[PDB]
Amino acid sequence: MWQQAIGDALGITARNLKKFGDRFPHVSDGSNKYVLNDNTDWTDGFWSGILWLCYEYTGDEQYREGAVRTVASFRERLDRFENLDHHDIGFLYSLSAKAQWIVEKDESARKLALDAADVLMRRWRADAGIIQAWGPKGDPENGGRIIIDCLLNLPLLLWAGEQTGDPEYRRVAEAHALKSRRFLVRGDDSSYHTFYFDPENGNAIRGGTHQGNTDGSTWTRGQAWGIYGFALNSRYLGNADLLETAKRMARHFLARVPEDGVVYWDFEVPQEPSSYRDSSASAITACGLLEIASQLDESDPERQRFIDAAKTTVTALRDGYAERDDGEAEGFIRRGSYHVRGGISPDDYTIWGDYYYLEALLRLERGVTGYWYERGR
């Protein structure tokens, strides 16, 4: 049921590793080819994650060697602080360095992830009680702004806290998660993409976005980050309120899934075929649904409901969006969208969409849960 889907991903990945060399895929732009970078964006970790997932599934050394090389690249990136003055250190290092520690207990990789967690900790703004998402400290524009995507960067901090025994990691992560719940999540279970606070006292100013259709709309990837994000923090914090929020956001998302089973880029624009989609949002949600289900009691009927919804989503992605390994295609799923309003790769491969699609497949087929937290823990 999932073997063929994984098989195509494995083949595409093997081909890509040989073609990309030491460079990293980010997104495609009008073709079946990825545009690469030299480990300078916020998405490089997803490539590492894909490599580790392929290794876990196959045991094929080619994937491990590729992943190990990306980890070496990440050490170099951290030690020269190249484009890391933002909150995405989690996406970057949880899926690469922490991932290697989770996969084979490599002490060097563990150290690198810990070093990265320290740099992320400096994104915390005590006066505002939030982790600053973008820009330098005190930035007039984004100095007191949080983004819902940040929930996925907290796992690195939480993991580090459990590794070191330093209570500050969890304190900072928990505060940010709770602040995100109160101000990013809406009363109808939808969500804002970003939220602004007064840098001086942390008081709420307003919610808004630059990637969703409007400040009051529902950017689907943003909603997806909430679903998986609140569920991941729920696990680490044993916080029932965050799990409840994950469930609420998931139900909201599920009720707005179109006919073919894959969402449009925003829930509040006409849900019409000529409109852009965001396969990555559906991929992220599939993982979030499975994560939520894993935290529910086996006697809870909604548990199997979410599991089945995740399966339906992955099948929808496979059937209508997945690329077959035709020796040319470089992405797993089509029609992801980076920045629709900005006209940036609105109908393309997204390395994060590819990563979550594969993580969902690995979860369903092997019970492999990715690299957000330790296994059997």
Side-chain angles (χ1 to χ4, degrees):
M1 181 177 264
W2 313 117
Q3 283 187 289
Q4 277 304 74
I6 294 171
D8 280 321
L10 294 175
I12 292 167
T13 301
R15 274 198 288 102
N16 287 343
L17 187 61
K18 298 181 178 180
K19 199 283 189 65
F20 303 165
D22 299 310
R23 308 195 75 198
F24 296 70
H26 177 226
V27 298
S28 65
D29 187 6
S31 78
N32 63 358
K33 300 298 187 304
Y34 261 113
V35 171
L36 317 175
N37 66 76
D38 305 297
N39 202 176
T40 56
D41 216 315
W42 68 276
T43 57
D44 300 274
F46 296 113
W47 174 226
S48 298
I50 287 173
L51 291 174
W52 282 123
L53 288 176
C54 289
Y55 176 50
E56 286 201 80
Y57 189 79
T58 64
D60 189 329
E61 188 65 33
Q62 82 181 312
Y63 298 115
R64 173 180 181 285
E65 295 194 354
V68 168
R69 288 192 290 280
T70 65
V71 177
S73 175
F74 274 115
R75 164 51 78 187
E76 299 192 12
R77 182 173 182 176
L78 184 67
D79 289 5
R80 72 173 66 149
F81 193 57
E82 176 170 28
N83 299 178
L84 294 177
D85 186 34
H86 55 262
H87 72 153
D88 294 312
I89 283 52
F91 283 125
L92 293 170
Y93 289 84
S94 282
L95 303 185
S96 55
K98 190 205 299 170
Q100 190 180 349
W101 164 253
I102 287 175
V103 172
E104 53 185 43
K105 294 289 183 175
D106 185 272
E107 180 58 56
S108 182
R110 175 180 173 286
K111 203 299 183 65
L112 174 54
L114 286 179
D115 285 342
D118 283 343
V119 176
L120 181 56
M121 274 302 280
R122 293 229 316 169
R123 276 267 110 193
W124 171 255
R125 304 295 174 244
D127 294 327
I130 61 175
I131 291 181
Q132 192 191 333
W134 307 311
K137 174 185 176 299
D139 184 63
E141 165 71 342
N142 306 306
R145 185 182 187 181
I146 63 168
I147 318 301
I148 194 163
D149 56 6
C150 196
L151 295 170
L152 285 287
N153 285 303
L154 304 184
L156 176 63
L157 298 184
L158 291 156
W159 170 82
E162 294 184 356
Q163 285 294 312
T164 62
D166 188 333
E168 270 298 292
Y169 291 105
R170 182 189 174 95
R171 198 205 70 177
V172 167
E174 189 143 77
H176 190 275
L178 290 175
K179 194 140 185 174
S180 297
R181 172 171 165 259
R182 181 169 175 106
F183 300 100
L184 283 170
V185 182
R186 305 209 189 90
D188 69 337
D189 297 340
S190 62
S191 61
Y192 283 101
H193 179 190
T194 80
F195 201 94
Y196 300 84
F197 297 97
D198 183 318
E200 194 62 59
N201 51 51
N203 293 321
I205 297 179
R206 61 168 303 177
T209 183
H210 73 299
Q211 269 178 293
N213 191 56
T214 70
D215 293 341
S217 72
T218 303
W219 181 47
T220 60
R221 180 152 72 254
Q223 183 79 186
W225 289 140
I227 297 170
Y228 201 177
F230 282 121
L232 289 173
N233 282 280
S234 166
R235 173 178 289 283
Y236 272 107
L237 305 170
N239 188 306
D241 295 316
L242 298 183
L243 181 59
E244 166 66 11
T245 290
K247 294 193 280 185
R248 296 177 178 183
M249 293 188 71
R251 298 165 187 150
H252 185 90
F253 189 102
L254 292 178
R256 297 171 172 67
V257 171
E259 323 63 20
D260 76 349
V262 178
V263 303
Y264 282 102
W265 72 285
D266 194 295
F267 287 138
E268 307 303 314
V269 293
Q271 305 290 279
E272 292 284 337
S274 74
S275 293
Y276 289 122
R277 301 274 186 159
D278 187 10
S279 59
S280 77
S282 290
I284 292 170
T285 295
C287 293
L289 289 168
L290 292 171
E291 175 59 38
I292 289 173
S294 74
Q295 292 178 52
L296 299 182
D297 198 65
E298 189 143 46
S299 64
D300 180 355
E302 185 168 52
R303 173 172 168 293
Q304 187 59 229
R305 193 182 311 156
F306 286 143
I307 292 176
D308 292 343
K311 291 179 174 179
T312 294
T313 303
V314 176
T315 295
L317 281 164
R318 169 63 178 172
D319 292 353
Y321 295 75
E323 293 282 49
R324 271 55 186 180
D325 180 13
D326 64 359
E328 290 296 307
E330 294 184 349
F332 299 165
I333 49 170
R334 305 179 297 277
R335 317 215 68 202
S337 49
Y338 192 14
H339 190 0
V340 171
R341 282 173 55 184
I344 310 302
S345 300
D347 194 347
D348 296 270
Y349 298 150
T350 66
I351 197 62
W352 58 95
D354 280 0
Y355 169 80
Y356 289 105
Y357 172 70
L358 187 57
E359 185 197 286
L361 285 170
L362 261 288
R363 277 174 173 271
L364 295 170
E365 182 68 13
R366 297 291 176 73
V368 168
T369 55
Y371 312 106
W372 309 104
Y373 54 80
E374 304 273 5
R375 302 285 169 71
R377 291 189 49 184

